[PDB]
């Protein structure tokens, strides 16, 4: 949760390097988690194979996060609108393009751009409007 | 297995669950779980096959780990509070450990991997007992400790269970595995409302129990464990496959069938608590369950698959054994929607 | 510390003898001398375990005899013993006690 | 689904062992009987939600009696500073603490 | 949760003696009729499963089905009405006991209020 | 929180009954018979107050009474009692059985010179009344004020305003 | 040194747990379990639980694992797997000891270690109570109350043991 | 919490990790189960003795009663697995999938 706090504390559209670094860290953590689960469920033949798979997944995820944060903060600076979800959408589509590039497939890239950008814009809208993915029981 | 011994083992399973749902002391609740496991294991192996033994071993290992984690959580809560009573749990680490243990007992993902395998290994009747009765005790325990439950962990497990139950079922042509994945998804649905309103969890559990009882009894009556063996049923007992189609549509949650009301009330309670994204995702993800239900229906009743010449022999004979509660279970599983406001009785 | 001392002394003495009997006589000069079925009757061993459990449950009885509710204590003690006897009788009659 | 059959039928199946301050053989008291009794008497009939804050003092005292984290922390501080002063040489433990006087019977 | 911890609730009691103050469900209640309809459908399905004549065989069995469904549904409806009445009673009592949490609001005529117009052009 | 009010060293200094366990056990029955009143008073104080500090004076009186008891024994029956406790001291369990003859000698001498009668079996174990001028502790546990109970059972039950009021259901 | 006998014993307990947890051949695993059971008996005895700790020595060491050994003997493996036999087993064994050492050192150096819970490095002798139990063994009376108070526990445990006998018979039937 | 509690909780965690990471043999995993039960017994006994919960001094005994029941069940399954496959190896429990 500390990584999420680091990403949130940086004001949107400011200190683009730090925002990109925090997004890179978040992507790295998610990639490591996915790598651990993949290693468990689908066993690697060798320890070197496991390291290669872990590095591949983690670098893919870290690149996705870094591009998303970098592009989003840059767009927020240039457009000078900090709260617009379109910046997050651009970041998400860029991350999807990076996913396609790492997967070396165009269709993966386009689908990832579309879906990931929509999800990123949704996340920004949730930040703005106070949407709760998990709501404390208030009934 | 001698029928007296079988009855004693079944009564021991039910007595373990009753002890779980009746005792106010944590040690006795864990004892009830231990009795449930001890009695259940031979019941799973009533018909002796290598698959039955493998399923029993997997189930024993999983439930043993769950019980050990549960007892550690109880011990930690004792250490930090000195209370044995089932109540608010006073240590967050104990709460998390207990939640993981109870989720593993319920088959909630990511502790779901054993449910499909065990269900496939055991017979249809043992599968019915496993997927209907065994769910009662852990759900009761969670309902009693609902307030202490961290909503984030329970909700994440519920959403993952729904997703995985929907995904796994699409790939399955074995009826028992399909039922297991459906059970996983419905368990996710039930545990979603646990932090918010427990009566909704009880209502969903009752509806799910009726639907699964009906489906398993229909499968037993048709003696089918694979999609094709069920496809052959239209030639022999068309009424059975028609009722199977109706029950499948109910399980999918289609209105106006009874399967709609638990989803409807769960969405209502979640929205009242400002949860909007989560109910939306759960409802959309239920479409995968609906899809493989529909594929099973296409295979079984809506479309007439080829039969075999030897079926003419089975035409002459009639079914010897009658399951008395099957008609009422079908009616409750399909036509109880006009009667939801009676959800204040279990309340 | 007394019990710990006794344990230490006994273990050390036995191990010392094992040393003087594994290495000390091994020095003596010599020459070159060259050089399972699945037991299903293990069920007896498993039954011992579940009977050893009742053994453990029955050990508190000497202090249990000191209570004021001697009626309840006696009823429960005979209940446990009768359940053990019933278990033995069941295994006996179902030919479960197939020793060797 | 906690069917309180014990309360309905007036049967004390397991509530005797639920708390440490309940009746115990030969009236052997628990190590935290007083604190537990106070905490229960405070948190009786007011509901769990109210009890979590209106009896927090009693619960904290009970937890301290059970685990003694704060007492051990205080004693650890005392031992640390005593060792520090002994190293600096500005403290000398009293003769009775060194064993030079017979303790009171 | 919610009504489970209400003070004075006798455990494992289907209908408390307080419920008798409420009107009994009328034997012509549409809900009870629907319960009887469910019983009749159960009888038809039992006949169909056992390959008996669907609408004519086992009139005694169908009668038992309908009677059982109606009998259980009567008590089910009575308990449902009891629980809803309990909810209403508790809600009104709490509203009275906490006037500040439920303040009376000043009522204004629409002429007094100002609601912006959004033309459909 | 608050500072613990430990009593001073001087106030807790008392004359000590410096006699070994065997000596006490030898005279235990007659000590209980004679010194019962101060001992019972001190016990009542300790159990009501639940604070060792509150009952220091009663403990002092108990110690003084024990010292007086032993002074009287020394004055009148010194040698038989010495023989009795030397006999008792030998046995590891300090059993009464092995020293019955010396017990008889000591009991006879104490009955003659001092008139004490050994309490019979099942006598010293009896719960006894104590008349005390010390007031009963009002709040021995120092309990805080109990939180106020929730309001309950307002009145009679009436039917729901419009039924279940659940979505579209009219009943 | 006698001041931290409980701590020394707990460390040995953790070491035995690493031993049987690294999974050598069930023979050495059994050895680790036996050592751990004896050491747990030692700790329990130090805390005043003579009877309870002795129970492990008889109904655990000479009981559950006495058959565990009898079982492994029936299912004999070709080679007695040891810690060094598999690099992973030896590596995990060393890492487990290292993990214990790290927490142990941290607990002693940092007066207050916090792995998942908060632990104070003061000796266990601190927590002990200064009360007197009189002519009684509190553990003995509590355990003997199982017949006077815990009648319900007696019923459930006896029924579970009987059903356990039946269950083991049915599982070992094999059809 | 004194350090002994830390050590015993660490022992339970280690045993749990060992159980969750099988290598080949089922008996080793059953050993981890019995080991976890020992940790729980020791922890419960220490808690109950320290708090002078007289009436809970029997809880460790019942825990062990059911520990041995679970062990016995595990061995009763392991023998059948060995009979059907010739070894206690976990890799033979592969017929049921997903």
Chain centroid, CA E94 distance in Å: 22
Residue C42 per-residue DSSP state: G
CB A19 within 8 Å of CB A82: no
∠ CA B168-B172-B177, nearest 5°, is 80
For the beta carbon of residue G32, count every other beta carbon within 10 angstroms: 22
| CA atoms G150, G153, G159, G162: torsion sign | negative
> Which residues of F are less than 8 Å from D58 in CB distance?
144
Identify which of F112, F134, F160 has the alpha carbon closest to the alpha carbon of residue F58.
F134
Nearest to G123 by CA among G46, G70, G18, G38: G46
> CA of F169: which chain B residue's CA is closest?
B341
Q: Angle CA(B307)–CA(B312)–CA(B317) in degrees, nearest 5?
A: 120
Q: Do E12 and D45 touch (CB under 8 A)?
A: no
Q: Which two tokens stand for residue B222?
A: 């048709």
* Angstrom distance (rounded) from CA B261 to CA B202: 12
Burial of C17 (0-12, 13-18, 19+ CB in 10 A): exposed
Structure tokens at G89: 């087993």
Quote the CA–CA distance of G64 and G73 in Å, as a whole number: 15
Q: Do D8 and E11 touch (CB under 8 A)?
A: yes
Cβ atoms B42, H11 nearer than 8 A: no
The resolution of the experimental structure, rounded to one decimal in Å, is 3.5
- The CA distances from residue G123 to F19, G13, G98, H2, in Å, are 35, 17, 22, 7
> Rounded to a whole number, what is the distance in Å from the CA of G105 to chain D's nearest CA?
16
Q: What is the C-alpha to C-alpha distance for residues G42 and G40, in angstroms, rounded to an integer?
A: 5
First to last CA, chain F: 59
| Residue E30 near chain D (CB below 8 Å) | no
Judged by CB atoms closer than 8 Å, whether chains meet at B84 and D17 is answered as yes
The count of C-alpha atoms lying within 13 angstroms of the C-alpha of B97, restricted to the half-sphere facing its C-beta, is 23
CA–CA distance, G107 with G109 (Å, rounded to integer): 6
Alpha-carbon separation of residue B206 from B102, B132, B163, B330 (angstroms): 19, 9, 22, 13
Integer Cα distance of G145 and C68 in angstroms: 11
Chains A and C touch (3+ CB pairs under 8 A): no
Whether E68 and E32 have beta carbons less than 8 Å apart is answered as: no
Q: How far apart are the first and last CA of chain E?
A: 52
Question: Which residues, 6 or more positions from D67, have their beta carbon under 8 angstroms from its beta carbon?
Answer: B79, B80, H1
Breaks (C-N over 2.5 A) in chain C follow: 35
Cα gap E42→E63, rounded to integer Å? 11
CB-based contact (8 Å) between F13 and chain D? Answer: no
F4, F34 contact by CB (below 8 A): no
**Out of A131, A136, A137, closest to residue B277 by CB:** A131
CB E54 within 8 A of CB E47: yes
Residues preceding gaps in chain D (C to N > 2.5 Å): none
- Dihedrals φ, ψ of E11, to 5°? -70, 150
Instruction: Give me the half-sphere count of Cα atoms (radius 13 Å) on the Cβ side of residue B186.
Output: 30
Report helix, strand or coil for B346.
coil
Q: Do the Cβ atoms of B86 and B144 come closer than 8 Å? A: yes
Judge whether B52 and B37 are in contact, CB under 8 Å: no
**Rounded Cα gap, residues B252 and C39, in angstroms:** 51
Where does residue F94 fall: left (phi above 0), alpha (psi -120 to 50 degrees), or beta otherwise? left
Contacts of B143 (CB under 8 A, 6+ apart): B194, B198, B201, B202, D1, D2, E1
Cis before B110 (ω within 30):
yes
Rounded CA-CA distance B240/B238 in Å is: 5
CB hemisphere CA count around B229 (13 angstroms): 13
Radius of gyration, CA atoms only, chain E: 25
The residue among B107, B145, B75 whose CA lies nearest residue D2 is B145
Give the integer Cα–Cα distance in Å for G39 and H22. 25
Distance in angstroms (rounded) separating the CA atoms of residues B262 and B202: 10
Q: Which CATH number fits domain G5-173: 1.20.120.1200, 3.40.50.2300, 3.20.20.140, 1.10.287.1040?
A: 1.20.120.1200
Contact between G170 and B42 using a beta-carbon 8 Å cutoff: yes
CA-based nearest residue to B195, from B149, B243, B237: B149
Asked if D58 has any chain F CB less than 8 Å from its own CB, the reply is: yes
Q: What is the DSSP letter of B298?
A: I
Place of tokens 């009788």: C89
SS3 F171: coil
Angle at CA of residue B116, ends B115 and B117, nearest 5°: 95
Q: How many helices (H) and strands (E) does chain A have?
A: 5, 0
Distance from C-alpha of H25 to C-alpha of G23, rounded to nearest angstrom: 8
Task: Confirm if G13 and H11 have CB atoms less than 8 A apart.
Answer: yes
Place of tokens 């051990």: D72
C-beta neighbour count of B298 within 10 angstroms: 14
Q: Which of G142, G145, G162, G174 to mutate to test the interface with H (most CBs of H within 10 A)?
A: G142
Domain boundaries, chain G: 5-173
* Largest Cα span, chain D: 70
The b-or-e profile of D85-95 (16+ CB within 10 A means b, else e) is eeeeeeeeeee
- Residue F142's H or E segment, with its range, is none
How far apart are the C-alpha atoms of C72 and H75, rounded to whole Å?
36
By Cβ distance, the residue of G122, G141, G150 closest to D72 is G122
Phi, psi of D56 (to 5 degrees): -65, -30
Among D14, D68, D79, the residue with its CB nearest the CB of G127 is D68
Q: Do D28 and G148 touch (CB under 8 A)?
A: no
Q: Are strands G112-114 and G118-120 parallel, antiparallel or unpaired?
A: antiparallel
Token digits of residue H2: 């004194």
Q: C13, exposed or middle or buried, with CB in 10 Å at 0-12, 13-18, 19+?
A: exposed
CA distances from B166 to A80, B275, E60, E94 (A): 43, 21, 44, 44
* Residue F166 Cα, gap to closest chain E Cα (Å): 10
Closest CA to B106 of B49, B48, B165, B147: B165
What span, in angstroms and rounded, lies between the C-alpha atoms of G122 and G113? 11
Give the distance, in angstroms, between the CA of residue C27 and the centroid of all CA atoms in the same chain: 38
**Domain spans in chain E, listed from the N-terminal domain onward:** 1-98
Kindly list the distances between the CA atom of residue B184 and the CA atoms of B106, B191, E71, E102, G71, in Å, as whole numbers in the listed order. 8, 11, 35, 43, 36
Contacts of G171 in chain B (CB under 8 A): 41-42, 45, 56
The answer to whether A18 touches A70, Cβ cutoff 8 Å, is no
C97 near G CB under 8 A:
no
Tell whether C99 is covered by a domain.
no
Provide the β-strand partners of residue B174.
B226
Residue A45: phi, psi to the nearest 5?
Answer: -65, -40
Select the residue from B275, B281, B284 to test the A interface by mutation, using most A Cβ atoms within 10 A. Answer: B275
CB B274 within 8 A of CB A130: no
Fold (topology level) of H3-92 = Helix Hairpins (1.10.287)
Tokens of C57: 């449950």
Nearest to G118 among D13, D17, D69 (CB): D69
CA distances from C45 to B242, C16, C58, C98, H73 (A): 53, 34, 20, 12, 13
Q: Give G157→chain H minimum CA distance, Å.
A: 7
Domain of C63? 1-94
**In Å, how far are B269, B343, E79, E92, H96 from E84, measured between CA atoms?**
17, 10, 9, 12, 49
E57 part of contact set with chain B, CB < 8 Å: no
φ/ψ (deg, to 5) at G160: -65, -40
Chain C neighbors of G71, CB-CB under 8 A? 42, 45
CA distance G39 to G13: 6
The token pair at G26 is 């069930």
Residues of G with Cβ-Cβ distance to D79 under 8 angstroms: 122
**Degrees, nearest 5: CA angle E112-E116-E121:** 140
Total structural domains within chain C: 1
**F25 is written with which tokens?**
């056990």
Q: What single string gives the DSSP state of each residue in F46-59?
A: HHHH--TTTTHHHH
G79 DSSP 8-state letter? S
Residue in chain B nearest F171 by alpha carbon = B341
- When CB atoms are compared, the residue of G126, G133, G138 closest to D72 is G126
- How many contacts does B have with G, using Cβ atoms within 8 A? 45
Contact E87 F158 (CB under 8 A): no
Task: Find chain G residues with C-beta within 8 A of C71's C-beta.
Answer: none
Q: Return the residue matching tokens 């239920």.
A: B286
Please report, for chain H, the start and end positions of each structural domain, with discontinuous segments joined by +.
3-92
Distance CA A110, CA A112 (A): 5
What phi and psi, each to the nearest 5 degrees, are found at residue F24?
A: -65, -45
Q: In angstroms, rounded to a whole number, what is the distance separating the alpha carbons of residues H43 and B76?
A: 9
CA distances (Å), origin D103, targets B274, G105, G126:
68, 36, 20
Contact assessment for residue G123 and residue H10, using Cβ atoms and an 8 Å cutoff: no
Which domain CATH number covers C28?
Answer: 1.20.58.1610
Nearest to E82 by CA among E6, F49, C21: E6
Buried-state track E10-34, b at ≥16 Cβ within 10 A, e below 16: eeeeeeeeebeebeebeeebebbeb
Indicate which of D9, D19, D76, D103 best probes the interface with G, i.e. most G CBs within 10 Å of its own CB: D76
Contacts 24+ apart (CB under 8 A), F119-123: F119/F29, F119/F32, F119/F33
| Distance from the first to the final alpha carbon of chain A | 26
Report the structure determination method.
cryo-EM
Give the pair of three-digit tokens for residue H37. Answer: 């039960």
DSSP string of B142-195, one letter each residue? HHHTTTTS-HHHHHHHHHHHHHHHHHHHHT--BHHHHHHHHHHHHHHHHHHSTT
Of the candidates F50, F146, F147, the beta carbon closest to that of D50 is on F147
What are the phi and psi torsion angles at G114 (to 5°)?
-140, 90
Task: Please list every residue in chain F whose beta carbon sits closer than 8 Å to the beta carbon of residue E21.
Answer: 156-158
DSSP state of A134: S
Query: Nearest Cα to G17, choosing from H68, H14, H20, H24?
Result: H14
Cβ within 8 Å, pair E79-B345:
yes
Q: How far is CA B345 from the centre of its chain?
A: 22
Residues whose CB falls within 8 Å of the CB of residue E92, separated by 6 or more in sequence, listed in order: none
Report how far apart the first and last C-alpha atoms of chain B are (Å, whole number): 40
Residue G112's beta-bridge partner residues?
G120
B19 to chain A, closest Cα gap in Å: 29
DSSP chain D: ----HHHHHT--SSGGGT-TTS--GGGPPPTTHHHHHHHHHHSSSS-HHHHHHHTHHHHHHHHHHHH-HHHHHHHHHHHHHHHHHHHHT-----TTTTT-SPPP-
Map residue A92 onto helix, strand or coil.
helix
Q: Is the peptide bond before B256 cis (omega within 30 degrees of 0)?
A: yes
- CA torsion, ordered F90, F91, F92, F93, to nearest 10 deg: -140
Interface of B to A at Cβ within 8 Å reads 151-152, 155, 195-197, 269-270, 272-278
Burial E63-101 (b: 16+ CB within 10 A, else e): eebbeebbeebbebbbbbbbbbbbbbbeeeeeeeeeeee
| β partners of residue B226 | B174
Q: What is the DSSP code string of G102-171? A: HHHHHHHHSSEEESSSEEE-S-GGGT-------SS-HHHHHHHHHHHT-HHHHHHHHHHHHHHHHHHHHH
Could you give phi then psi for residue H25, rounded to 5 degrees? -85, 145
């Amino acid at each position: 949760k500390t990584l999420l706090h680091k990403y949130s504390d940086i004001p949107e559209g400011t200190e683009c390097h730090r925002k990109a670094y925090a997004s890179t860290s978040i992507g790295g953590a998610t990639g490591l988690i996915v790598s651990a689960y993949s290693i468990a469920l689908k066993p690697p033949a060798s320890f070197l194979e496991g390291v290669a798979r872990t590095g591949r997944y983690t670098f893919t995820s870290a690149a996705i996060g870094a591009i998303f944060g970098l592009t989003s903060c840059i767009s927020a600076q240039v457009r000078e609108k900090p709260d617009d979800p379109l910046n997050y959408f651009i970041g998400g589509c860029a991350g999807g393009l990076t996913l396609g590039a790492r997967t070396r497939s165009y269709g993966i890239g386009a689908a990832a751009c579309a879906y990931m950008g929509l999800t990123a814009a949704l996340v920004k809208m949730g930040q703005l409007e106070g949407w709760q993915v998990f709501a404390e029981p208030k009934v | 297995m001698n029928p007296i011994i079988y009855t004693t083992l079944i009564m021991t399973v039910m007595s373990g669950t009753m002890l779980v749902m009746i005792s106010s002391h944590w040690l006795l609740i864990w004892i009830g779980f231990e009795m449930n496991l001890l009695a259940m294991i031979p019941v799973l192996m009533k018909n002796f096959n290598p698959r039955a033994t493998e399923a029993a071993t997997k189930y024993f290992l999983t439930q043993a780990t769950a019980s050990m984690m549960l007892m550690m959580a109880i011990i930690i809560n004792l250490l930090y509070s000195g209370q044995w009573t089932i109540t608010k749990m006073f240590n967050p680490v104990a709460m998390t450990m207990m939640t993981m243990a109870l989720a593993m007992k319920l088959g909630l993902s990511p502790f779901h991997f054993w449910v499909p395998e065990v269900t496939q290994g055991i017979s249809l009747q043992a599968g019915l007992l496993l997927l209907t009765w065994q769910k009662l005790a852990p759900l009761s325990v969670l309902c009693q400790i609902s307030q202490s439950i961290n909503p984030n962990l329970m909700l994440t497990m519920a959403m993952l269970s729904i997703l995985i139950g929907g995904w796994g079922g699409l790939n399955q042509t074995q009826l028992r595995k399909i039922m297991a994945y459906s059970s996983i998804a419905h368990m996710g649905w039930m545990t979603a409302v646990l932090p918010y309103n427990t009566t909704m969890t009880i209502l969903n559990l009752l509806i799910y129990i009726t639907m699964t009882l009906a489906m398993f009894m229909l499968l037993i009556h048709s003696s089918a464990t694979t999609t094709l063996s069920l496809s052959h049923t239209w030639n022999k007992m068309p009424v059975i496959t028609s009722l199977m189609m109706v029950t499948l549509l109910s399980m999918g949650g289609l209105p106006p069938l009874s399967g709609f009301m638990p989803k409807w009330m769960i969405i209502q309670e979640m929205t009242k608590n400002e949860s909007i994204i989560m109910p939306t995702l759960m409802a959309m993800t239920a479409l995968l369950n609906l899809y493989f239900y529909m594929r099973l229906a296409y295979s079984s009743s809506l479309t007439m698959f080829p039969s075999t010449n030897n079926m003419k022999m089975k035409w002459q004979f009639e079914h010897t054994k009658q399951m008395k509660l099957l008609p009422t279970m079908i009616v409750l599983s399909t036509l109880v929607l006009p009667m939801t406001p009676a959800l204040s009785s279990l309340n | 510390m007394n019990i710990m001392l006794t344990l230490l002394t006994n273990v050390t003495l036995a191990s010392l003898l094992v040393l003087i009997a594994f290495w000390l006589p091994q020095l003596n000069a010599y020459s070159e001398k060259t050089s399972p079925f699945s037991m299903k009757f293990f069920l007896v061993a498993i039954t011992f375990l579940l009977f050893d459990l009742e053994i453990a449950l029955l050990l508190p009885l000497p202090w249990a005899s000191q209570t004021n509710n001697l009626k309840t204590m006696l009823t429960m003690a005979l209940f446990l013993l009768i359940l053990l006897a019933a278990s033995l009788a069941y295994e006996w009659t179902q030919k479960g006690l197939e020793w060797a | 689904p906690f069917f309180d059959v014990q309360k309905r039928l007036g049967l004390d199946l397991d509530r005797w062992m639920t708390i440490q301050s309940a009746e115990q053989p030969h009236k052997i008291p628990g190590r935290c009987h007083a604190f537990e009794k106070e905490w229960i008497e405070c948190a009786h009939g007011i509901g769990g939600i109210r009890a979590e804050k209106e009896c927090k003092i009693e619960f904290d005292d009970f937890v301290e009696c059970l685990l003694r984290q704060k007492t051990m922390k205080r004693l650890s501080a005392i031992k640390r500073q005593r060792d520090k002063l002994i190293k600096e040489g500005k403290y000398t433990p009293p003769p009775h603490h060194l064993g030079k006087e017979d303790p009171r019977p | 949760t919610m009504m489970s911890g209400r003070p004075g609730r006798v455990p494992l009691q289907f209908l408390p003696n307080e419920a008798r103050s409420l009107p009994p469900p009328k034997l012509t209640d549409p809900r009870l009729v629907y319960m009887g309809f469910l019983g009749y459908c159960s009888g038809l399905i039992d006949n169909a499963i056992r390959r008996r004549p669907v609408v004519s065989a086992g009139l005694h069995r169908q009668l038992l089905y309908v009677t059982s469904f109606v009998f259980f549904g009567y008590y089910l409806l009575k308990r449902q009405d009891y629980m809803y009445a309990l909810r209403d009673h508790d809600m009104f009592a709490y509203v009275k006991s906490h006037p500040e949490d439920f303040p009376e609001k000043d009522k204004k005529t629409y002429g007094e209020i100002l609601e912006e117009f959004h033309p459909v052009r | 929180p608050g500072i613990v009010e430990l009593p001073t060293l001087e106030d807790l200094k008392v004359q000590e009954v410096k006699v070994s366990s065997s000596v006490l056990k030898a005279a235990a029955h007659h000590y209980g018979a004679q010194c019962d009143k101060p001992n019972k008073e001190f016990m009542l104080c300790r159990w009501e107050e639940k604070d060792p500090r509150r009952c220091l004076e009663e403990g002092k009186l108990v110690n003084q009474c024990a010292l007086d008891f032993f002074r009287q024994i020394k004055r009148h029956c010194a040698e038989p009692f010495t023989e009795y406790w030397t006999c008792i001291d030998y046995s590891g369990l300090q059993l009464f059985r092995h020293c019955r003859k010396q017990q008889a000698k000591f009991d006879e001498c104490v009955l003659d010179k001092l008139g004490w009668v050994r309490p019979d079996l099942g006598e010293l174990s009896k719960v006894t009344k104590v008349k005390t001028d010390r007031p009963l502790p009002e709040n021995p546990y120092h309990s805080r004020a109990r939180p106020e109970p929730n309001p309950e059972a307002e009145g009679d039950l009436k039917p729901a305003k419009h039924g279940s009021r659940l979505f579209f259901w009219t009943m | 040194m006698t001041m931290y006998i409980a701590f020394i014993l707990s460390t040995i307990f953790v070491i035995g747990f690493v031993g049987f947890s690294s999974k050598p051949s069930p023979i050495y695993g059994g050895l680790g379990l036996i050592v751990s059971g004896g050491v747990g008996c030692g700790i329990v005895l130090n805390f005043g639980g003579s009877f309870l700790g002795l129970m492990v020595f008889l109904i655990y060491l000479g009981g559950m694992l006495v058959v565990f050994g009898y079982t492994t003997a029936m299912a004999t493996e070709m080679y007695p797997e040891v810690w060094v036999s598999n690099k992973t087993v030896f590596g995990a064994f060393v890492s487990g000891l290292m993990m214990e050492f790290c927490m142990v050192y941290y607990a002693l150096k940092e007066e207050e270690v916090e792995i998942i819970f908060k632990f104070n490095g003061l000796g266990d002798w601190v927590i002990y109570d200064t009360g007197d139990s009189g002519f009684f063994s509190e553990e003995a009376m509590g355990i003997a109350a199982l017949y006077s108070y815990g009648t319900w526990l007696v019923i459930v445990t006896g029924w579970s043991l009987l059903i356990g006998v039946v269950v083991i018979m049915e599982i070992t039937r094999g059809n | 919490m004194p350090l002994v509690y830390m050590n015993i909780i660490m022992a339970f965690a280690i045993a749990l990790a060992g159980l969750l990471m099988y290598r080949s043999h089922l008996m080793s995993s059953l050993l981890c189960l019995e080991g976890m039960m020992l940790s729980l017994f020791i922890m419960s006994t220490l808690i109950i003795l320290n708090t002078h919960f007289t009436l809970a001094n029997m809880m460790p005994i019942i825990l062990l009663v059911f520990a041995a029941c679970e062990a016995a069940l595990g061995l009763s399954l392991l023998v059948m697995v060995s009979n059907t496959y010739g070894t206690d190896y976990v890799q033979n429990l592969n017929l049921l999938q997903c």
